[PDB]
Design an enzyme around this catalytic site. Structure first.
Site, PDB file in Angstrom:
ATOM      1  CG  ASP A 131      15.245 -13.184 -41.783  1.00 11.66           C
ATOM      2  OD1 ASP A 131      15.126 -13.054 -43.070  1.00 11.66           O
ATOM      3  OD2 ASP A 131      14.348 -12.778 -41.016  1.00 11.66           O
ATOM      4  CD  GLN A 135       9.757  -7.127 -40.783  1.00  6.71           C
ATOM      5  OE1 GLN A 135       8.841  -6.853 -41.741  1.00  6.71           O
ATOM      6  NE2 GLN A 135       9.692  -7.949 -40.021  1.00  6.71           N
ATOM      7  CG  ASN A 136      14.829  -8.456 -39.398  1.00  7.89           C
ATOM      8  OD1 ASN A 136      13.603  -8.200 -39.255  1.00  7.89           O
ATOM      9  ND2 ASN A 136      15.211  -9.461 -40.157  1.00  7.89           N
TER      10      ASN A 136
END
Ligand SMILES: O=S(=O)(O)c1cccc2cccc(Nc3ccccc3)c12
Ligand SMILES: O=S(=O)(O)c1cccc2cccc(Nc3ccccc3)c12
Length: 302
Positions: A131, A135-136
């Site tokens: 994923d 953002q991660n």
């Protein structure tokens, strides 16, 4: 000595990954600030799937400069608190703050190189992120960037809730997943990273779809609708439909204007349709694009 939640003082909310809110906290005994992630368990059925337990174990085993460091896991009444090193800044926030001018190429190169190092490590240890999105990816003052918010829970059905805020995960999803492949491979992470590379360069997401079919069509409209020549086996994939519109591939001079032939060469290898032809993280590290890579420090004015 065991750590207890009473030992930590919440400072502020620093985000809300796929597992709810993430809090900046201060260890009352050492004064160290950390990032705490709260995980609500589920004895709904009977437990966590054995394969899931194995995958969590695999992730826990990883120690690398480009993977956020898990310091401790505190268990208490049907709840788990993950204690991580404190970081608070991420690529998404950073890109938004660099919107007006864009992140400088030396930093783009450094971040991409480091993310490839992190992925190469994970992949060699049989761990996939699944994923990857701006953002991660967490950044620190010294110029490191680190993998976080792995897609483990949704991938192996871990008994825990996810996406406390919403979604946008489709934008970085590999085409073989969108087409229903029985088994995907480590190549899915390279596709995601290639999308992130393009986004850093152009300052806008590459394929901002709003549904699986829309995501697929946005990809097709840019890279061309794949056929058997470009991607052997594509027309037999579970969700492939011959009714798909046939689009011609666009030139990268148009898709990612700022890039030169070295950048375009690498991007094209990361976005190859065929998973079996897509460049691996290890091979990407040797790409000519990285000949002059350095470790610039970001300008963070929080
Ligand atoms: O392995 S742990 O380090 O705890 C762990 C670490 C990080 C995330 C986890 C998510 C679900 C279950 C775990 N294990 C678990 C095992 C027994 C009881 C409750 C949770 C997780
Ligand atoms: O939080 S993450 O940034 O993904 C993460 C980062 C680094 C190491 C991790 C080790 C175990 C579980 C994680 N997360 C996790 C949490 C709940 C369920 C399953 C996995 C780890």
């Amino acid at each position: 000595s065991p750590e207890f939640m009473e030992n930590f003082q919440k400072v502020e909310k620093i985000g809300e990954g796929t597992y709810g809110v993430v809090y900046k906290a201060r260890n009352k005994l050492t004064g160290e600030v950390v990032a705490l992630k709260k995980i609500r368990l589920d004895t709904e059925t009977e437990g966590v799937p054995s394969t899931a337990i194995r995958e969590i174990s695999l992730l826990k085993e990883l120690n690398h400069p480009n993977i956020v460091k898990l310091l401790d896991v505190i268990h208490t009444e049907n709840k788990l608190y993950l204690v991580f090193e404190f970081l608070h800044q991420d690529l998404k926030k950073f890109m938004d703050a660099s919107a007006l001018t864009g992140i400088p190429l030396p930093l783009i190169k450094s971040y991409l190189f480091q993310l490839l190092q992190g992925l190469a490590f994970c992949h060699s240890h049989r761990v996939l992120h699944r994923d990857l999105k701006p953002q991660n990816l967490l950044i620190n003052t010294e110029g490191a960037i680190k993998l976080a918010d792995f897609g483990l829970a949704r991938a192996f059905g871990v008994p825990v809730r996810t996406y406390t805020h919403e979604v946008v995960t489709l934008w970085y999803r590999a085409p073989e997943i969108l087409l229903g492949c029985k088994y995907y491979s480590t190549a899915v992470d390279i596709w995601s990273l290639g999308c992130i590379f393009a986004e850093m360069v152009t300052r806008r997401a590459l394929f901002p779809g709003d549904s699986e079919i829309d995501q697929l069509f946005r990809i097709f409209r840019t890279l061309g609708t794949p056929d058997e020549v470009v991607w052997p086996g594509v027309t037999s994939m579970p969700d492939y439909k011959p009714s798909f519109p046939k689009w011609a591939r666009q030139d990268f001079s148009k898709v990612v204007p700022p890039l030169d032939e070295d950048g375009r060469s690498l991007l094209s290898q990361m976005l190859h349709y065929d998973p079996n032809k897509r460049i691996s993280a290890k091979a990407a590290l040797a790409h000519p694009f990285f000949q002059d890579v350095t470790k610039p420090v970001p300008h963070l004015r929080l």
